[PDB]
Ligand binder design. Structure first.
Ligand SMILES: CC(C)CN(C[C@@H](O)[C@H](Cc1ccccc1)NC(=O)O[C@H]1CO[C@H]2OCC[C@H]21)S(=O)(=O)c1ccc(N)cc1
Lengths: 99, 99
């Protein structure tokens, strides 16, 4: 699909068996999802953006369906105000910025 | 152009006659630039990011060249870790997300 930017580019994702709404974010290096339970060992990481840093749990090799497209990669879990799909997964689904 | 996301989508912008580097960010509603002197009066605005809120100065009708495309709109100036080109300006250059 070709997404216009008049509004937030929100899509439905499936992760860990749950359905969630997330933002397709070209400005995000990594994907960050609100607090939830995921299987596996994880390692702590600090992620910084506007306003500062938050502590997150880094889970590797997580499968996520984005708008119906299966993808695999690292997912950071923590206190984010919105679910964000970053470049690490956008590349996997072949997303591009066009103008 | 068609920009892939294996690397941060950074482009050159020309504002106030100066050349700077900026990130094409579909996850940002608004355009935010690092501290610099812009013309006219400003209005206050609070911007919420991943790590909290910062206070910024809002300047309207600012002329900005993005990767060679002229745009005229609102620009926020504040303590951002990187210059961000948000949806308000992305729409003016006709950017879309495609996959
Ligand atoms: C600041 C950028 C370099 C990176 N940010 C992604 C960015 O797209 C966020 C993503 C974002 C989106 C909504 C809420 C929090 C974070 N948007 C944002 O900061 O925008 C602010 C200015 O415009 C306003 O409208 C959106 C919030 C304001 S980030 O959220 O801090 C971030 C940092 C590291 C990773 N791995 C993933 C994301």
């Amino acid at each position: 699909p070709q997404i216009t930017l008049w509004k937030r580019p929100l899509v439905t994702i499936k992760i860990g068996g749950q359905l969630k709404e997330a933002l397709l974010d070209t400005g995000a290096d990594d994907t960050i999802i609100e607090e939830m339970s995921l299987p596996g060992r994880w390692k702590p990481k600090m992620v910084g953006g506007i306003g500062g840093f938050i502590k997150v749990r880094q889970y590797d090799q997580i499968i996520i369906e984005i708008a119906g497209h299966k993808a695999i990669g690292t997912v950071l879990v923590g206190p984010t105000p919105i679910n964000i799909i970053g470049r690490n997964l956008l590349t996997q689904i072949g997303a591009t910025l066009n103008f």
